């Protein structure tokens, strides 16, 4: 329910005695947290808005040379001085050209030439600063329960839904608590400042399009710039990059400027992050977030309820949600009130033993109206199983066959953990961790390797990183020595680091 | 004259019985040809007008996306379709998105999404094709004689100038004859097809800027193009090189056009030539010719004249023309009429012996007025010398010292002809050729290695040429064999091929 259609949902179950579980709540992923006694809730980070942008370098990427002039003197008679050479809104270049009797001079030799061109910028790039005391992460939550199919993307009006809530966790209030009426209150304890390392990033703006440009890339590209937010006629130091001073003949000197390099920088942003701007606040469309989840105040609505009595009905026949879950929606025809649907998985009809785990604890009909739609989600076993719901002989059953194997899921979870460890690195030890001497020492021994990899192999791009991965595969399959394991860890360390993209 | 101020003017000697000499007319250089008993002519190519350019493929370098749409389809329910991918001017890509019960569908899985976007171009690059049967070179000639310094580049009037003449050299009429009244007619026999390999170049056009660009470069840059022969709504083949389709993760595919690539191609030429155009015909500023100078019928003006009486006065001081030569401009005072200036260079003034090559043969004042300005050209020997421009005791003697030496001139002209052989390659063996069994064998051995070097070492923009040169120093110092030369002969031959560029 808001987590059922996403491909990258991960299931985090098992706590430190039931107190808390530590999740790395990503922006494109969704997270389903479940216990044996507690209602499972699907928690998804939806936005990351960066507020209150300060201005740093604002480059000029399409310039225009206005009024010019020049002055030349004969050789061995000094160099030229034009009145707009000590002006800093003009760009100026001196050179030595051939000057002889044909030019007007009276001595053959190299003359002296000065060409001044008024630098006038048309439209400029602007690089805003994104600093960690301005973030306001919206994390939507939604508990599994008395809800139907039209409450998955249905978001218009949620403060009066009792099941779903937004918890805007800013680092100005790094811990929050959501009142899930009836279900208790899910408490979050995020670390919004230790997110995507936002002290080392800016928020570039070009032709009303916005990015998250890395800090090292933004302070080195050679293009005409000024200092801050002075939006008048700036100083534009380093104006030589776009203007071009070639050689003057007796009657030709083209000081043409280079054209609009918006396209030259769209082609240079090969690693940036497409953000969007809704005014002064920047809605980012990416980001991982740390969050410890306290659930000891989150309890089951309707555990005391009596079982259902009569007249189920399959509307919207079951379907498989890309992981092995089977979303079955029912329509309970009956006014016995707040009852509990007895749904399970049965291999043998007249054994009715529960064979498949059920992902949404105590599914409950809530409305006292006659035809109440309601949604489940079931985790069948590998193979064949029936969706036995209702009690007695008026039951409504359904055959399901989920194809797969146990060894296939453990490989699909090794791939899910390797892509999590390639995106996060050290943080991937804090996604299903309840703390310990094994799930928190491995990350401390991994932050050292992560610092000796971000600094050692730097940030090499995809192709050259493959080009040095295959070279370390080949150094692995030779160099016959007692340390045969010498250089075969930056091969899986480089391929899985990007072959899993 | 027309040549006395240029830095790389060359002085050529030696004829096949006086009938002809062979030269390669550099476009930035000038050539002074002198014979035994006939006037020295200054020969310069000044323009190269290319008429009748028929255009080819014409790129777009900044696009604009009009109205958008996108359609999705459930898993295993087909593939999506709009009305607008059946229109050739809209760009469209099919991709897979997650669909579920939240997104209205009925089966969970990867859907199908088609995103159409109306391509509209507003800025164009234009490739014009040029064939050698449309070249229009121009050779301005100007002999040394009755000229004053305000007639060096005074191209205002040459059909009655009696000393200066244009010769239009074209593929249709390559041989030409320049009528110089009194001097006869210098016959030229150029070959304009074997100029600057002009059948493998184009003529770009970008915001009223023109270039010479290699055919192979223009047929390789990946930008949305229509074929150029379409003068309506263009087709724009390969539109997908300016638009970018990105799936965020979910049922959302954005389309964003990349920016104006104008500065990306100003920075991507960097090896092209600049060019203007004065109509439909594009005047170039670079190239050369292969020009035979049929000097046989060029006769000397005013040999039978009387000699000058007296009263020569300087108008301005002699100056040294960067080559050791010194130009001296006198003013004859008197009305004897068309007489001959009696000037020569004196070492040991007491005997008054001529010592240096007086460049301007038959120095003749033609106009009979009282004060007539006149120009001479001198080559003093290496050292102290005197410039006598008269007869009797009223002669003019100017002390001249030329700073230099004989072995310094021989190494400056060995490097000067090695830069000339590096710029031209094959043709620089026919810059002063008289037709020999060695100057035409050294040419065949240089054209063979030049074709076995331009095909072996392809395009390398100086930096890789130095990298591979320095790379061949260590491989010419090792691998003891007879081919340690063959890796060191193409060591100096490649880095110095790039040094003086």
């Amino acid at each position: 329910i808001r987590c059922i259609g996403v491909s990258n949902r991960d299931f985090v179950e098992g706590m430190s005695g039931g107190t808390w579980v530590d999740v790395v709540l990503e922006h494109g992923g969704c997270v389903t947290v479940m216990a044996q006694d507690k209602p499972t809730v699907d928690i998804e980070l939806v936005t990351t808005t960066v507020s209150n942008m300060a201005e740093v370098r604002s480059y000029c990427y399409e310039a225009s040379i206005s009024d010019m002039a020049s002055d030349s003197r004969c050789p061995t008679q000094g160099e030229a001085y034009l009145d707009k050479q000590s002006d800093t809104q003009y760009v100026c270049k001196r050179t030595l050209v051939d000057r002889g009797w044909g030019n007007g001079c009276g001595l053959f030799g190299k003359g002296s030439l000065v060409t001044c061109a008024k630098f006038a910028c048309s439209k400029k790039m602007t690089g805003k600063s994104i600093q960690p005391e301005n973030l306001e992460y919206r994390i939507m939550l939604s508990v599994h329960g008395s809800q139907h199919s039209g409450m998955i993307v249905n978001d218009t009006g949620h403060e009066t839904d009792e099941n779903r809530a937004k918890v805007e966790i800013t680092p100005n209030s790094p811990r929050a608590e959501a009142t899930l009426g009836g279900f208790g209150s899910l408490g979050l304890d995020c670390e919004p400042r230790t997110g995507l390392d936002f002290s080392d990033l800016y928020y570039l703006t070009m032709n009303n399009k916005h990015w998250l440009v890395h800090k090292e890339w933004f302070h080195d590209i050679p293009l005409p710039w000024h200092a801050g937010a002075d939006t008048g006629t700036p100083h534009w130091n380093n104006k030589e990059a776009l203007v071009e001073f070639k050689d003057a003949h007796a009657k030709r000197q083209t000081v043409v400027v280079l054209g609009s390099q918006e396209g030259a920088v769209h082609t240079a942003l090969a690693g940036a992050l497409e953000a969007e701007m809704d005014g002064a606040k920047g809605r980012l469309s990416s980001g991982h977030l740390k969050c410890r989840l306290k659930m000891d105040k989150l309890r089951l609505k309707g555990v005391s309820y009596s079982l259902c009595t009569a007249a189920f009905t399959f509307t919207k026949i079951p379907a498989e949600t890309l992981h092995g879950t089977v979303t079955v929606e029912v329509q309970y025809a009956g006014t016995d009130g707040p009852c509990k649907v007895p749904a399970q998985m049965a291999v043998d009809m007249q054994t009715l033993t529960p064979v498949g785990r059920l992902i949404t604890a105590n599914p409950v009909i809530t409305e006292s109206t006659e035809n109440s739609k309601m949604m489940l989600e079931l985790d069948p076993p590998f193979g064949d199983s029936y969706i036995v719901i209702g009690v007695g002989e008026k039951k409504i059953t359904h055959h399901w066959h989920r194809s797969g194997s146990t060894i296939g899921k453990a490989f699909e979870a090794t791939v899910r953990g390797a892509k999590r460890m390639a995106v996060l690195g050290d943080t991937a030890w804090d996604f299903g961790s309840v703390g310990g001497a094994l799930n928190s020492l491995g990350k401390g021994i991994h932050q050292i390797f992560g610092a000796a990899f971000k600094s050692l192999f730097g940030g090499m791009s995809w192709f050259s990183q493959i080009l040095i991965g295959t070279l370390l595969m080949w150094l692995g399959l030779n160099t016959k020595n007692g340390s045969i394991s010498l250089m075969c860890l930056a091969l899986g360390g480089v391929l899985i680091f990007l072959s899993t993209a | 004259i027309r040549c006395i101020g240029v830095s790389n003017r060359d002085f050529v000697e030696g004829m096949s019985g006086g009938t002809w000499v062979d030269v390669v007319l550099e476009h930035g250089g000038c050539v002074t040809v002198m014979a035994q008993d006939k006037p020295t002519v200054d020969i310069e190519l000044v323009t190269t007008t290319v008429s009748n350019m028929a255009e080819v493929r014409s790129y777009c370098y900044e696009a604009s996306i009009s109205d958008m749409a996108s359609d999705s389809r459930c898993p295993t329910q087909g593939e999506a379709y709009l009305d607008k991918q059946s229109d050739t001017q809209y760009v469209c890509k099919r991709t897979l998105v997650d669909r579920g019960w939240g997104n209205g569908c009925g089966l969970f899985g990867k859907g199908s999404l088609v995103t159409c976007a109306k391509f509209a171009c507003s800025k164009k690059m234009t490739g014009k094709s040029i064939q050698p049967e449309n070249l229009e070179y121009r050779i301005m000639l100007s002999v040394h004689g009755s000229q004053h310094s305000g007639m060096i580049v005074n191209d205002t009037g040459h059909e009655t100038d009696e000393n200066r003449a244009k010769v239009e050299i074209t593929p249709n009429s390559p041989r030409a004859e320049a009528t110089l009244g009194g001097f006869g007619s210098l016959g030229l026999d150029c070959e304009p097809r074997t100029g600057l390999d002009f059948s493998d170049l184009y003529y770009l056009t970008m915001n009223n800027k023109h270039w010479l660009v290699h055919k192979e470069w223009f047929h390789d840059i990946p930008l949305p193009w229509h074929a150029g022969a379409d003068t309506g709504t263009p087709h724009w083949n390969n539109k997908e090189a300016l638009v970018e389709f990105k799936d965020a993760h979910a049922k959302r595919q954005t389309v964003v056009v990349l920016g104006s690539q104008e500065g990306a191609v100003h920075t991507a030429l960097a090896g092209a030539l600049e060019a203007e155009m004065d109509g439909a015909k594009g005047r170039l500023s670079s190239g050369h010719l292969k020009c035979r100078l049929k000097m046989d019928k060029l006769r000397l003006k005013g040999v039978s004249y009387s000699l000058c009486t007296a009263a020569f006065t300087f108008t301005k001081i002699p100056a040294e023309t960067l080559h050791g030569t010194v130009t001296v401009e006198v003013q004859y005072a008197g009305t004897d009429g068309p007489c001959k200036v009696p000037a020569q260079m004196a070492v040991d003034m007491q005997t008054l012996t001529p010592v240096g090559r007086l460049i301007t043969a038959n120095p003749v004042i033609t106009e009979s007025t009282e004060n007539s300005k006149m120009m001479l050209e001198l080559d003093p020997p290496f050292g102290d010398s005197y410039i006598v421009i008269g007869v009797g005791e009223k002669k003019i003697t100017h002390h001249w010292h030329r700073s230099g030496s004989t072995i310094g001139k021989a190494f400056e002209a060995t490097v000067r002809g090695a830069k000339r052989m590096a710029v031209l390659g094959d043709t620089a063996w026919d810059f002063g050729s008289v037709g020999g069994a060695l100057n035409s064998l050294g040419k065949g051995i240089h054209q063979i290695f030049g074709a076995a070097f331009k095909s072996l070492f392809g395009g390398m923009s100086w930096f890789s040429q130095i990298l591979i040169g320095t790379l061949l120093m260590w491989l010419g110092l090792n691998t003891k064999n007879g081919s340690i030369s063959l890796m060191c002969l193409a060591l100096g031959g490649v880095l110095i091929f790039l040094s003086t560029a």
Partner: antibody
Amino acid sequence: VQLVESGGGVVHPGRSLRLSCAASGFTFSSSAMHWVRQAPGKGLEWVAVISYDGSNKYYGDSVKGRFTISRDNSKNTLYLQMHSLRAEDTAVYYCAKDRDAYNTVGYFAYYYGMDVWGQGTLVTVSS
Amino acid sequence: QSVLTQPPSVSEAPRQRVTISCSGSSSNIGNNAVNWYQQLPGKAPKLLIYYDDLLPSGVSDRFSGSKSGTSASLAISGLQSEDEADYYCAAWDDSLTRYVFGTGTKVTVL
């Protein structure tokens, strides 16, 4: 850029007559000058140019050697004197500034042509 | 030639392009750049295009210049109800060493 002429007069052919003009703000020594004539009922006709020093000083082939243009650097003022002056040369006069310096006039003087004028005052040479 | 003839008067409908064709010779136009000038009804002239295709600051972008051989075609596009003024060509000829003006080009809006 603020330039104004002065020195009109009505004089019969063959005596002295002068005009003058000046400006400020920018530098006057490192710029050139040129005096322009404009007969009513006609367009404009050029008169003379002065370099940034005065050595190079060129007059048009209409009234060569007959009008004398005078100024130099350290005065910030332009003059124009005329004596033994032709009869129907009466016209408005203009003090425009060719935006260059004319150390050479046609070689490395790419950007010639004058920026900003002022509405001057004409003279009258008639009976 | 030092006369520099060019058409006296031109009448073009508004919002279309107007050409001014100058045919000098290689004395002035055919070797170095050409200038072009704007003299107001009452006020004094100003320059419009120096170096034959450039625009000084302070003038509308309606104008544009060109210089092909001895064909100087100047272009005022989108003629409106204000430029009822005269237009002048000018170039330096270096042999006769003069700054030759033009004859005159008046346009009327209609």
